[PDB]
Amino acid sequence: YEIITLTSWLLQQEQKGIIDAELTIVLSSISMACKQIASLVQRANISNLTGEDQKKLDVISNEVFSNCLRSSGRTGIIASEEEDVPVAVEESYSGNYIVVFDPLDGSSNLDAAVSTGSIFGIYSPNDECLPDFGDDSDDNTLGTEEQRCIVNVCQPGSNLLAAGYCMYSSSVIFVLTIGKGVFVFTLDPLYGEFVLTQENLQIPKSGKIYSFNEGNYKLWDENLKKYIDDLKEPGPSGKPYSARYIGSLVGDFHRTLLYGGIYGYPRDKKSKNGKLRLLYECAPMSFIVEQAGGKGSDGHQRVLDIQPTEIHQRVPLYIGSTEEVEKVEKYLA
Amino acid sequence: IITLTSWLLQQEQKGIIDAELTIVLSSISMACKQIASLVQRANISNLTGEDQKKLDVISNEVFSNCLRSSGRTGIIASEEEDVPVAVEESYSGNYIVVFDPLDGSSNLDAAVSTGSIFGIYSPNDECLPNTLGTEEQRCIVNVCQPGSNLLAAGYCMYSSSVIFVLTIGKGVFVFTLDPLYGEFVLTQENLQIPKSGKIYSFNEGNYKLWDENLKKYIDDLKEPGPSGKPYSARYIGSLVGDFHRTLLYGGIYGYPRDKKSKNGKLRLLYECAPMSFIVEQAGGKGSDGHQRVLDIQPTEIHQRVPLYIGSTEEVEKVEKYLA
Amino acid sequence: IITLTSWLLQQEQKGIIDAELTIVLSSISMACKQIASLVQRANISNLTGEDQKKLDVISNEVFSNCLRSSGRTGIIASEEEDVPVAVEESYSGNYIVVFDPLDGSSNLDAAVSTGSIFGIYSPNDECLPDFGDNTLGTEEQRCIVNVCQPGSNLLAAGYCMYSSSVIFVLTIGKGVFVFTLDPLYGEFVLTQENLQIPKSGKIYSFNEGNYKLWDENLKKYIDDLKEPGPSGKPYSARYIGSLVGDFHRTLLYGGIYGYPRDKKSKNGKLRLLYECAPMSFIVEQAGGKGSDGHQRVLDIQPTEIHQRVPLYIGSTEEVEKVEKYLA
Amino acid sequence: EIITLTSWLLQQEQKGIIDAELTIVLSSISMACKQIASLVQRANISNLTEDQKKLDVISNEVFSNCLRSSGRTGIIASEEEDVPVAVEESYSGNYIVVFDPLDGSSNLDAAVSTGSIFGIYSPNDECLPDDNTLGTEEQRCIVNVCQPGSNLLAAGYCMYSSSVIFVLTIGKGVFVFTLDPLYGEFVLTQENLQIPKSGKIYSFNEGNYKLWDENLKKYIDDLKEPGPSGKPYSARYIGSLVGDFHRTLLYGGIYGYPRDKKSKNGKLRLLYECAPMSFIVEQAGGKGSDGHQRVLDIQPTEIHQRVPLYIGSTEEVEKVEKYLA
């Protein structure tokens, strides 16, 4: 009616029977973990007084997540293979839900200069993957067997129930979809609560803005190079495409969601299969974009049609406005 | 933990700055704290009341109120879509503060960050007699000479972190806002921008509108050197955001001229001058492609100029291609 | 660290409260966070006695906005030197929230502390007319007084104290829970479960300036408290003047608080429905007693619009002691 | 328009009223108070992972850290159920700050409010040198070095209640600063505060009535007499020295902590509590007495010397002195 907080909104969806009380608690706990991580990000410079500065924050953030979700279930960590961010996987005691949580969107200080964010996906599994806990088991680290079970149990195309992200920038924004549209919540610094600021967000069908790291231009295929060249051609009013690339996956994606356009992390000569991980990053983002009326593709097929088969599977990503993604797909055919 | 207040009082005690300037700097930081909050709650405030356009206006009012104990403030109205500038002139006639409330008027460019930019000058004449007229603007230009009477400069970035960067003539100092206690805390002393950095910040969407000079330089940055590793490209669209990242990690930022804008888009007095002074204090370079920005004296207040700023070796490289 | 939000969601899961009431309670705590800020900045906001009265009004508007998604709210105007009460009636007709924005209209009594008091009832009719002057008339006040019965349909009650610490005290029928606001993260954190007020406590809270206006009954009780027992230590006297502040201290450390009747106020000053009822329900859940000097406050059925009653509240043994003097 | 403590201090410095060194001391003290306020607000939470006494020690540490650029600080350990006092001596030897971190060591008395009290002196000598505690030789030095009657330059307190208030006097009036929770800065909300000449409000712990002298009992009894109209005095007693004093300063009246059968010389300490409060009240146009004489006129002899206190509106204090003669 006037002020709708995340708590009130979740309780309303529950009354409507859209989600159950258990999921209401999981989603509410995730947002609480995000409030704390936001604070960690804002004070990082200060905390470091009394560059692996972004790599240590990944770890502390995963511990904050674990503590906030201790009443729903146990949490394990899928260790970083390369320069990847370690992923937190929480499995409910009841066996009804599994939350795959990406604490921050990167491990680079440069890419986190102005923004960063958390990404999560909630699945409804058939199995129990995580074992028990430990007395002096300091390492939460999941083993080859447990990492395998999670990859097999979490299926983007058939059991992803909810997805969202929380952006930490000049504003702290919580974006969520429980299967019926995208909802945007803004954190009120004053009262420490997420306030509903946008319902049923729709990403524009088109937008003359492209987000790619053009420093890798000579490492791309001739397909992609021509697409990139043609965007620089002043079409109509004699106005070419605008280029914007923060380097922050959440920041670039959020801007694409609000103003339209296309974001891309293609494959190149060094990263033959791209860089973004299919299960941890691309799946949740693609589900969200599709709920907002957009498209998430790997250049040829729909990302959500790809079944994860490897622990750290990577894939190229073209996401954003439908007409823009369709345009890049025509050049890559 | 040294706060901005404690740090300012120590500089004053050292005779580096006088009490009056201590008050001006302290008031500016107070205005930035408030503007930061406005930016953080923009979405909510808009639920009950062109979003970055009126934020410009409210921010200028916050500035005026915080500096009312130092002097009076006038507003230099925006021509096109540009940001209205606040000019404060001390009652004593010793200082003039040129304040750019926000770094842009576009929602797109302010999606993740924005910021305030200011410069403090020691005038010769008294210009201020809400909006300043042509006669006052003319006076402001002749009085504020970036190349000789710019005493202090800085900016406040509003992003995942609220950062206050300041220079009073002897190095660059970085202050981070503690959300907890509402105070700026010194987190970096005598900041030095790296001499080189393989990162370039340009809007490549305008590539075909650039001169063949510049196109050549941009193309060569994509050549994987002897490591099979090209330059990285980063461009937020936020002047304060892109500049700050360049200041901490090195590289080059550029806002060149094009076919339809023979002189670029960034304003010389309001944006380029304070940024150039800061970069030079950190050991870097601020050029228009051929000369030092601080060597240029505006003839008109709204004068614009191309900008190439960042690491010394990177800026020297672009100058060589533009010769 | 269990926050109020997590705690409320846990009670809603156990089926102790329904989702609608979870929203009402969550909205009230939100309203209290905002009111706390208004109180902390009052001196500054006024740079732009009756500073307390104006705060009463703004606080009621904050309450209304935070509860607009649950129902409509009317205001029972401040006739005398009483605080205007906000009454919110849910759209569904299942709940009514009687909200006292601040505990007084005096600057003197709010020098160091103040607070909000509320009670949630499950009515048997509709009283709020319509809106969308939200002041409730004589007929609407009558309906509310009949519909709100502290002894049978008061489901939840609590208060939020604004002092050197911001404390939210709540009871949903199964014990008293204390939540402390973390200035840092803007969230109420559970700091005490199932609070129990001591059975006795040698501390009395009365305005002794009115001593010569009291009955000889009360004067005698007051006199005997000053007698140092065989330990050589008499009762300690503490009186802030803030109802919420004096009550809270009584709840944590024990003792007795009283606002008796006197020659000027033959029926006491505190209002039965808006102040005494919620306070008595809370004290009883913490293991104490709330009396009017002769009977249990919650046994008295509100029959008038501006009904007042004397109040003796606190530790069971202390309240039973004053009743023995007044009999 | 909006004046912060920093701007106000800098203006007094420009006016030559105080020197830069004192400007830093006062600025540093207010910084310690912002931190102590936060400790008080989160006490219940911090204790999750009796409570007033441990808070006394941490507060003194915060004070020491904030004043490390001005001088060194020692601690005068609690003799009984008192609060340990922090004494800071400037490196230059120009100033000594006597800081009482909290106004009590009782949880009951701090249920709604508490506060810090400080006094700044200009000594004729140099006292200070596991135990950052001052010894017998150092304690005997401070008592003789700090004379509230002649060398007390500035005094004030910071109240932690529903509002965080910083009250200060540098010799030319009392000034009130309110902390803005939002921007973390003290804002000037009242200049040259004047305590009313009379006030029909009294602040005493009447639970000790039968332990008082017949003098005082008579005074206390007569206040209950509905005089002229038919309205007797109002009674208000929080139990918090800073809280009760602050209310007396703004609305007038009388506050008293007399001597009783149990405490023959009163409970409040002369140097640490009564001296700063009396200086402030006199600057606001009020009176601070021990019942027979002006508190500031008395000279400390013992390190923890105590004295009865009657402080507040001039006419009210003069009235009690009339009954105690």
In order, the DSSP letters of D277-307 are HHHHHHHTT-EEESSSSBGGGS---STT-B-
| Helix H or strand E segment including C253 | helix C243-253
Q: How many CA atoms lie within 13 A of D16 on its CB side?
A: 0
The answer to whether B254 and B200 are in contact (CB under 8 A) is yes
The answer to whether B159 and B112 are in contact (CB under 8 A) is yes
Q: For testing the chain C interface, which of D163, D189, D200, D201 should be mutated: the one with the most C CBs within 10 Å?
A: D163
- Which technique was the structure solved with, according to the deposited record? X-ray
Q: What angle do CA C132, C138, C143 make, to 5 degrees?
A: 80
The residue count for chain B: 323
> In the sheet that A242-243 helps form, which strands lie side by side, from edge to edge?
A242-243, A209-211, A262-265, A317-320, A295-297
Q: What angle do CA B14, B15, B19 make, to 5 degrees?
A: 110
Residue C232 burial (C-beta neighbours within 10 Å; 0-12, 13-18, 19+): exposed
Extract the tokens encoding D19.
């020197």
CATH architecture of D193-323: 3-Layer(aba) Sandwich (3.40)
Alpha-carbon distances of B120 from B12, B95, B98, B123, B168, rounded to whole Å: 16, 7, 7, 9, 9
Q: Tell me how far apart the terminal alpha carbons of chain C are, to the nearest angstrom.
A: 48
The C-alpha of B144 sits at a distance from chain D's nearest C-alpha, in angstroms, of: 26
Distance of CA D66 to the CA centre of its chain: 20
Which candidate in D102, D179, D249, D324 is catalytic?
Answer: D102
The answer to whether C56 and C102 are in contact (CB under 8 A) is yes
Distance of CA C83 to the CA centre of its chain: 12
Helices marked H in C50-173: 51-66, 138-147
Report domain extents, chain C: 1-194, 195-325
Contact (CB<8Å) B230/A243:
no
d(CA D103, CA A318): 64
d(CA A151, CA D313): 77
Domain spanning A201-332, CATH class:
alpha beta
Question: Topology of domain A1-200, per CATH?
Answer: Fructose-1,6-Bisphosphatase; Chain A, domain 1 (3.30.540)
Alpha-carbon distances of A146 from A209, B183, D11, rounded to whole Å: 41, 46, 67
Catalytic annotation present for D21: no
Extract the tokens encoding B50.
């062109």
- Encode burial over A235-263: b for 16+ CB neighbours within 10 A, e otherwise: eeeeebbbbbbbbbbbbbbbbbbbbbbbb
> In the sheet that B114-121 helps form, which strands lie side by side, from edge to edge?
B71-76, B85-90, B96-100, B114-121, B150-158, B162-167, B173-178, B183-188
Strands (E), chain D: 71-76, 85-90, 96-100, 114-121, 152-160, 164-169, 175-180, 185-190, 201-203, 234-235, 254-257, 287-289, 309-312
Which of D23, D31, D183 comes nearest B33 by C-beta?
D183
Catalytic annotation present for D297: no
Q: For testing the chain A interface, which of B112, B155, B243, B248 should be mutated: the one with the most A CBs within 10 Å?
A: B112
Residue D185 bridge partners (DSSP): D180
Task: Find, among C183, B30, B37, the residue nearest to D36 by Cα.
Answer: C183
Helix (H, G, I), strand (E, B) or coil at B246: helix
Longest dimension (CA), chain D: 62
d(CA A121, CA A30): 11
Which residues lie below 8 Å from residue B109, measured CB to CB, with a gap of 6+?
A244, B103, B236, B237, B238
Which residues lie below 8 Å from residue C80, measured CB to CB, with a gap of 6+?
none
CATH architecture of C195-325: 3-Layer(aba) Sandwich (3.40)
Contact (CB<8Å) A116/B160:
yes
| Helix H or strand E segment including B20 | helix B19-40
The answer to whether C260 and C214 are in contact (CB under 8 A) is yes
d(CA C290, CA C313): 4
Extract the tokens encoding A135.
């007395």
Extract the tokens encoding C310.
């004397």
Q: What angle do CA B1, B4, B10 make, to 5 degrees?
A: 90
Residue D311 bridge partners (DSSP): D255, D288
The beta-carbon contacts of A226-229 under 8 Å, at least 24 apart in sequence, are: A226/A331, A227/A327, A227/A328, A227/A331, A227/A332
In order, the DSSP letters of A235-263 are -SSS---EE-B-S-HHHHHHHHHHH--EE
| Helix H or strand E segment including D20 | helix D20-41
Rg (CA), chain C: 19
Extract the tokens encoding C184.
């840092």
Helix (H, G, I), strand (E, B) or coil at A10: helix
Longest dimension (CA), chain C: 65
The answer to whether A272 and A291 are in contact (CB under 8 A) is no
Task: Find, among A167, A168, A3, A75, the residue nearest to A176 by Cα.
Answer: A167
Catalytic annotation present for D214: no
D222, amino acid identity = D
Q: How many CB atoms lie within 10 A of CB A333?
A: 8
A210: nearest CA in chain B? B205
Q: Which residues of A touch C (CB under 8 A)?
A: 1-5, 7-8, 11-12, 14-15, 21-22, 24-25, 28-29, 32, 35-36, 39, 71, 189-193
Contact (CB<8Å) A32/C68:
no
Q: What angle do CA C258, C260, C263 make, to 5 degrees?
A: 155
In order, the DSSP letters of D68-112 are TTTEEEEEE--SSS-PPEEEEEETTSS-EEEEESSS-S-TGGGSS
Contact (CB<8Å) B26/D3:
no
Extract the tokens encoding A249.
């996956």
d(CA B288, CA C215): 90
Rg (CA), chain B: 19
Rg (CA), chain A: 20
d(CA A9, CA A200): 13
Helix (H, G, I), strand (E, B) or coil at D6: helix
Which residues lie below 8 Å from residue B85, measured CB to CB, with a gap of 6+?
B75, B76, B98, B99, B100, B101, B270
Domain D1-192 CATH (choose: 3.40.50.2300, 3.40.50.1360, 3.30.540.10, 3.30.70.360) = 3.30.540.10
The answer to whether D294 and D251 are in contact (CB under 8 A) is no
d(CA B282, CA B289): 20
Strands (E), chain A: 73-78, 87-92, 98-102, 116-123, 160-168, 172-177, 183-188, 193-198, 209-211, 242-243, 262-265, 295-297, 317-320
Q: For testing the chain B interface, which of D185, D186, D187 should be mutated: the one with the most B CBs within 10 Å?
A: D185
Task: Find, among C286, C220, C280, the residue nearest to C254 by Cα.
Answer: C286
* In the block, residue with structure tokens 């060398």: D151
Contact (CB<8Å) B176/A110:
no
In this structure, the strands spanning D287-289 and A183-188 are unpaired
Helices marked H in C123-163: 138-147
The answer to whether A125 and A98 are in contact (CB under 8 A) is yes
d(CA B226, CA A8): 58
- Encode burial over B12-29: b for 16+ CB neighbours within 10 A, e otherwise: bbeeebebbbbbbbbbbb
CATH number of C1-194: 3.30.540.10
B79 is in an annotated binding site: yes
The answer to whether D77 and D135 are in contact (CB under 8 A) is no
> In the sheet that D287-289 helps form, which strands lie side by side, from edge to edge?
D234-235, D201-203, D254-257, D309-312, D287-289
The answer to whether A300 and A289 are in contact (CB under 8 A) is no
Task: Find, among B260, B272, B316, B280, the residue nearest to B296 by Cα.
Answer: B272
d(CA C141, CA C127): 8
Strands (E), C172-262: 176-182, 187-192, 203-205, 236-237, 256-259
The C-alpha of A11 sits at a distance from chain C's nearest C-alpha, in angstroms, of: 6
Q: How many CA atoms lie within 13 A of D278 on its CB side?
A: 27
B194, amino acid identity = P
* Residue C249 with chain D: CB contacts under 8 Å: 108, 111-112
C162, amino acid identity = Y
In this structure, the strands spanning A87-92 and A73-78 are antiparallel
d(CA D279, CA D296): 7
Which residues lie below 8 Å from residue D227, measured CB to CB, with a gap of 6+?
none
HEC assignment per residue over B41-66: CHHHHCCCCCCCCHHHHHHHHHHHHH
Q: What angle do CA B307, B310, B311 make, to 5 degrees?
A: 140
Domain spanning B191-321, CATH class:
alpha beta
CATH superfamily of B1-190: Fructose-1,6-Bisphosphatase, subunit A, domain 1 (3.30.540.10)
* Residue B249 with chain A: CB contacts under 8 Å: 109-110, 113
* Residue B26 with chain D: CB contacts under 8 Å: 4, 6-7, 10
Handedness of CA B260, B262, B263, B264 (dihedral sign): positive
